[PDB]
């Protein structure tokens, strides 16, 4: 059948403290393990 | 031949053990232990913030119970003793004996914020206010099962001379209203392994539980293990029972098929769109005392041809056509129920309008996904009739885009006529 | 396998006795004697001061009858002959034959000043003016009992495929209205599974002893449980509900001093306001004999009482609080029934306003005795609920006084808040 | 209970390779045992509007409904359905419906708008005319279905609900149930030629259809046509046994209690029932399908004993007058109800209603003359109160003058005054 998932995507499209904490976790892990 | 038995919602038998549940619902659960010649009753709550558990030694051996937010109602079916227990204990407990003829029993009990209700096997129907004052006595078909939520009371009747029927009421502090009286109930009764026979000895009607949605719509879960919800009950000329969840099919599906048996659904409450229930495993159909966590099943409209799924799957996955059918139907019925609640009862958490808007989004998306397959079979009229169903005009533009990609200029033309009409 | 039988209100078996009744009523009674295998019918009255007794040979074998104020209606269940006989003879008697399909019976008949009605074991509902012209034909579930008053008709239906149910209707001038329409009836059939009882239920398997409209037009019925059921608020279908306003077994148990006697039974004639007019049968057979007792009375009484309490605390005497429970509920239902009658039909007897005032007095007085029963135990919340149920201002200040002598100042304030909310209107 | 499938006026095989699935105003459907395969034929009574066709069927369709726009087919046990428009420009479509363990499809129906399927477990499934599923509902177990335009009429039965029916209309805003599983006053069947049929149709519902004027009808094991009058107002609805075909066949048999003549109902159209007159041992039509025929509607007021005492059968005029007054009254009420709610379907009903009210008063005048000939004042005066037209009241005045009964003359003149002074 005709796929329409991109049509449905253009229908569906109609900084945060959590991101900062996740970035801190990434930085902490990379720092701890890197030389 | 038939025998009346006491019922309480989702209560269990003793079986081969010395403790059982009297009831369980969205508020909590009650259990009783055969402590030699007397009974140890424990009342337990799911919201430990609002309510605190308690227990007491029971010398009468209550076999009926009901549990709302405000208090617990108890009854002893064979002696006519009943007791009511407010949960604050700033209002007093009280006890009463209601009269029984020889061989008559209390079959069910329920309570509301301003009333206590008792139904017997000879169909007397006795109302007391919440402080025990007698207020009325009716006679009806015998009330085999009975519950309430806030001021709304929903009762199921049966006799050999009347058949299965139900009543729905909204008793209130004032404007005491009756929506339907002893209308026939389309539920299926059990057929005439021994754990099943033991359960039906305990509960011949085979009603596993009976309750309201969180938005206040009647529900019942019969011997077919199919959750029924009464839609549009607020206007009796349009009311209809919807089979919102065939739990046998959903258990079969989620287990990958394979004739899966010895797992059973024990319903507690529906909430919005998701049955809270205990998934009991093993030979016995009913839960054990260390009450398992009530697992969650989202409702599923019964459009799943088992043979088709067997051919596809031979872990089970659903063809997108069948999935879009179920999505369209489920979103439509849930949106109708939300619309009726918001028109009549109004918002209670203050986000139901956003939920209903998102739900209409799912509805239109399901219609577009069906429309695409209709266009893939190049049926202009099936496509157009599907196009008529969409709610959002902006979503109806996507049908134009699809029918362009499916090379149906006739469909594009017709849809633009619908656009021009919908512009009004 | 079921067998239909002809029925009429308060009719009886023969048994092994050749004298039998076809019906009994507040107006009178009808009986037959099978002389030489024809039937000398006797029509008799309880208010002979305005009606003559009369007597004739029925050669057709009428087994159905319905006596009313204006005349009597007879019917023969098998051949389908029906006959109407007014009480004066300025109006003519008349006779007609009704069609019977194969294996059918006429099962019951009824009459009014403005209508005649017939029902059959295949559910044909056939109705006429009072002169025998067929004004309508209709099909229902099989009719097994039937009664009427003025424009109003109440009928009971049964089959293996429909279950016990009733219909209530009225001839409006424009069209016939059904208030209730083969709705399930909460009466109990007899236990089919003692020999005199078996004889009666062979005569009448449905177990209905009588069914009639009240003196105020409410439908009433009386079955194998020997309770009297009245359909309250029949004037509004969605909220109409059956009230078991009397249990005759309980009242017989009381009047016989708690003795479980087998030898007294109540035979219903008609309900008039607070009292069932009835014939108290005695002995082995559970229906009246040829010399009728006088039309006796019982007061209606709501079944709030329980034997296990009256046995210990009581020819049976009743504790005051429980007596007040009965009086309160009876005053409540009677007040509602007369209020609905006054609103819907007006005064049928020209004094119901004063009866209603008396009922309001009894209502509030029973509530005040319950108020004292609550303040006795300092149950403030129960007392205040009762205070909301009280309706006349005199009783509200009486409740203040009872609160004062029981020292509930909280109730003094709260009752006076109820008063203030009311008298300011 | 058994729950065998139903279709309007279908017939059993009866140790024969041919049977009918459906019969209607438009036509009939039949099937042949073609070894394990089945041949199916779709045939029409209006071969001017429609054309017959065949197809070979490996599923074994045993449910069918024959709507003027198209034929709907169904397989009871496998749960497959198929819709075949007669204007074959529109595509066929197929749907396999979910059937639970031990369930069957028990009935199907079709309309210009909506398609309906019902099952032995009481599932009630709806589709648009192109196969899109629009709704699912649960009722008590469906045993029969029929439909017309937006209006649907269904019968239900179980050991736990009793024989009952629902009447419904899909309004464009919302569906309305006019009556909903109300108890149905039809008699179930109470030898072997009858038993071979009741093993195929245990409810004994020979057919289930709407009138030409859109009023529900059912034809039961008692061989009476029941029509539900004033269904548009459930406060007042009445099942009328408008025709007893046993009585009419007995009358046409000259008073003989014939075992060898039977009727198969197709459809009511005003004062007549389209039906097929089958004869002989079997009570259902046979392979060489006899022609459609019209019985008049005649209400069961005839007394058998009195008629054979009077006596083809000839009726005494007073009894005939009772029947014609009664039937004209009910048909007049049905025409007023349909005209007020739905208007003229055929551009003819207003004039027919005027003629019909004429028949009503004329039958009453025959009764009034009969009563006056007996010198019965009270019966005649009551009969005069029924008269609908002033021509009839003036005629009654002159009839009572002719009967030398001036009390009626004066009282009826005052009734006439009370009418015309308004």
Curated annotation (Swiss-Prot), chain A:
Q: Where in the cell is it found?
A: Nucleus
Give start-end of the signal peptide. Answer: none
Q: Source organism's superkingdom?
A: Eukaryota
Protein's job: Required for DNA replication. Functions as part of the GINS complex which plays an essential role in the initiation of DNA replication by binding to DNA replication origins and facilitating the assembly of the DNA replication machinery.
Q: Which family does it belong to?
A: Belongs to the GINS4/SLD5 family.
Quaternary structure note? Component of the GINS complex which is a heterotetramer composed of SLD5, PSF1, PSF2 and PSF3. Interacts with PSF2.
Instruction: Quote the protein name from its UniProt record.
Output: DNA replication complex GINS protein SLD5
Span of the entire protein shown here: 2 to 74 of 294
UniProtKB/Swiss-Prot annotation, chain C:
Q: Provide this UniProt record's keywords sorted from A to Z.
A: DNA replication, Nucleus, Phosphoprotein, Repeat, WD repeat
Q: What is its main location?
A: nucleus
Q: Does the keyword Repeat apply?
A: yes
A GO BP term, please?
mitotic cell cycle
GO cellular component terms? Cul8-RING ubiquitin ligase complex; nuclear chromosome; nuclear replication fork; nucleus
Where found?
Nucleus
Q: Where are the WD repeats?
A: 223-263
Q: Name one GO molecular function term.
A: identical protein binding
Q: State the remark under miscellaneous.
A: Present with 3280 molecules/cell in log phase SD medium.
Q: What does it do?
A: Accessory factor for DNA replication. It plays a role in accurately duplicating the genome in vivo.
Name recorded for this polypeptide: DNA polymerase alpha-binding protein
This chain's source organism reads: Saccharomyces cerevisiae (strain ATCC 204508 / S288c)
Q: Which residues of the full protein are shown?
A: 473 to 924 of 927
């Amino acid at each position: 059948d005709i796929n329409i998932d991109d049509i449905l995507a253009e229908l569906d499209k109609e900084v945060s403290p959590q991101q900062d904490f996740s970035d801190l976790m990434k930085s902490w892990k990379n720092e701890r393990c890197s030389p | 031949k038939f025998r009346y038995m006491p019922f309480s919602p989702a209560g269990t038998p003793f079986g081969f053990t010395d403790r059982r549940y009297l009831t369980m619902n969205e508020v909590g659960y009650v259990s009783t232990v055969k402590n030699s010649e007397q009974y140890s009753i424990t009342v337990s709550f799911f919201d430990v913030g609002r309510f605190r558990e308690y227990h007491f030694e029971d010398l009468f051996g209550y076999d009926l119970c009901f549990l709302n937010e405000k208090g617990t109602l108890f009854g002893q079916s064979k002696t006519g003793q009943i007791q009511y227990r407010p949960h604050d204990s700033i209002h007093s407990n009280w006890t009463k004996i209601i009269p029984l003829q020889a061989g008559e029993r209390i079959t069910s009990v329920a309570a509301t914020p301003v009333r206590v209700i008792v139904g017997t096997s000879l169909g007397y129907f006795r109302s007391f206010n919440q402080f025990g004052v007698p207020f009325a006595v009716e006679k009806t078909s015998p009330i085999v099962a009975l519950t309430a939520q806030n001021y709304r009371v929903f009762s199921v009747h049966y006799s050999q001379f009347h058949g299965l029927s139900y009543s729905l009421s909204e008793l209130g502090t004032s404007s005491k209203r009756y929506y339907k009286r002893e209308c026939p109930l389309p539920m299926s009764l059990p057929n005439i392994k021994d754990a099943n026979l033991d359960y039906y000895n305990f509960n011949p009607m085979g009603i596993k539980s009976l309750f309201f949605s969180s938005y206040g719509d009647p529900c019942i879960f019969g011997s077919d293990n199919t959750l029924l919800l009464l839609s549009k009950w607020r206007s009796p000329e349009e009311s209809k029972w919807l089979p919102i969840l065939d739990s046998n099919m959903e258990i079969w599906k989620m287990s990958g098929g394979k004739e899966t048996t010895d797992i059973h659904v024990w319903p507690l409450a529906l909430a919005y769109d998701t049955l809270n229930c205990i998934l009991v495993k093993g030979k016995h159909i009913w839960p054990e005392f260390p009450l398992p966590l009530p697992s969650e099943m989202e409702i599923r409209m019964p459009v799943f041809v088992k043979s088709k799924l067997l051919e596809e799957n031979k872990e089970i996955q659903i063809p997108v056509s069948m999935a879009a059918e179920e999505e369209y139907l489920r979103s439509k019925v849930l949106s109708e129920l939300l619309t009726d609640t918001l028109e009549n009862d109004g918002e209670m958490y203050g986000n139901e309008n956003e939920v209903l808007a998102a739900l209409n989004g799912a509805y239109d998306k399901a219609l577009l996904r069906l429309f695409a397959s209709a266009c893939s079979d190049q049926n202009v009229e099936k496509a157009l009739s599907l196009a008529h169903e969409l709610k959002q005009d902006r979503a109806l533009t996507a049908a134009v885009k699809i029918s362009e990609r499916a090379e149906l200029p006739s469909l594009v033309k017709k849809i633009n006529n619908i656009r021009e009409a919908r512009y009004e």
